[PDB]
Design a protein around this ligand. Sequence first.
Ligand SMILES: NC(=O)C1=CN([C@@H]2O[C@H](COP(=O)(O)OP(=O)(O)OC[C@H]3O[C@@H](n4cnc5c(N)ncnc54)[C@H](OP(=O)(O)O)[C@@H]3O)[C@@H](O)[C@H]2O)C=CC1
Ligand SMILES: Nc1nc(=O)c2nc(CNc3ccc(C(=O)N[C@@H](CCC(=O)O)C(=O)O)cc3)cnc2[nH]1
Length: 186
Amino acid sequence: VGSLNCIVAVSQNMGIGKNGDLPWPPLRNEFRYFQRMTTTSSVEGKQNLVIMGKKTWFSIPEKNRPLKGRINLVLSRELKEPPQGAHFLSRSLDDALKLTEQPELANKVDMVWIVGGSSVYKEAMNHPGHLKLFVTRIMQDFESDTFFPEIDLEKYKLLPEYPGVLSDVQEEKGIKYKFEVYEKND
Ligand SMILES: NC(=O)C1=CN([C@@H]2O[C@H](COP(=O)(O)OP(=O)(O)OC[C@H]3O[C@@H](n4cnc5c(N)ncnc54)[C@H](OP(=O)(O)O)[C@@H]3O)[C@@H](O)[C@H]2O)C=CC1
Ligand SMILES: Nc1nc(=O)c2nc(CNc3ccc(C(=O)N[C@@H](CCC(=O)O)C(=O)O)cc3)cnc2[nH]1
């Protein structure tokens, strides 16, 4: 795997979760952006892979699991087999990426997307080589119990724009937010 993508939405106080759900009310177009970015592949015969922690898996509504049109891989040190509805299970991020080149998946995966939680983001963001971070900045404070790790500008550049990503401030349900893309190459 020559590149990884992370995607996250974060409040001004760096919050990503509260009580097993999001800290803010549902933002429909923001969710549609997460869906569009994690699902879209123009490579015939392949699908994207989403990698997530166990708590993040159980935070997805049951009727929406597995995330449609994507190969769903959960990370856990405890489980014997993937949680019901998931496609694959790995004991670490390293193992997950290695699984993509075994026969079952060799001819099958396009882009890899890391979708949380905190521990999964931290490790991915230090992983060697090319990595993009798609960060939605929710422009308000929200009470939270789960937080996004700091972005090290020694390694990451904020890109001025990005094809297919809106540049202007967005608003839904009276809450302002903006889409950012960060990149590192080494
Ligand atoms: N705003 C946003 O963009 C997002 C928000 N969320 C929110 O964040 C919260 C969930 O995140 P969080 O609490 O961080 O939990 P995680 O999703 O990271 O899940 C924790 C569990 O996942 C497993 N796990 C995590 N990392 C690894 C690893 N490297 N190797 C093996 N297993 C691993 C472990 O399971 P085990 O104990 O079985 O070993 C661990 O106990 C929820 O509130 C959710 O709604 C989540 C993602 C993004
Ligand atoms: N940018 C961004 N926003 C998020 O809300 C977000 N959430 C998570 C973790 N939580 C979740 C919770 C629910 C679904 C979910 O049901 N997604 C469906 C439907 C999206 C929709 O309702 O339109 C999907 O098909 O992707 C995904 C991730 C990870 N990265 C994110 N990244």
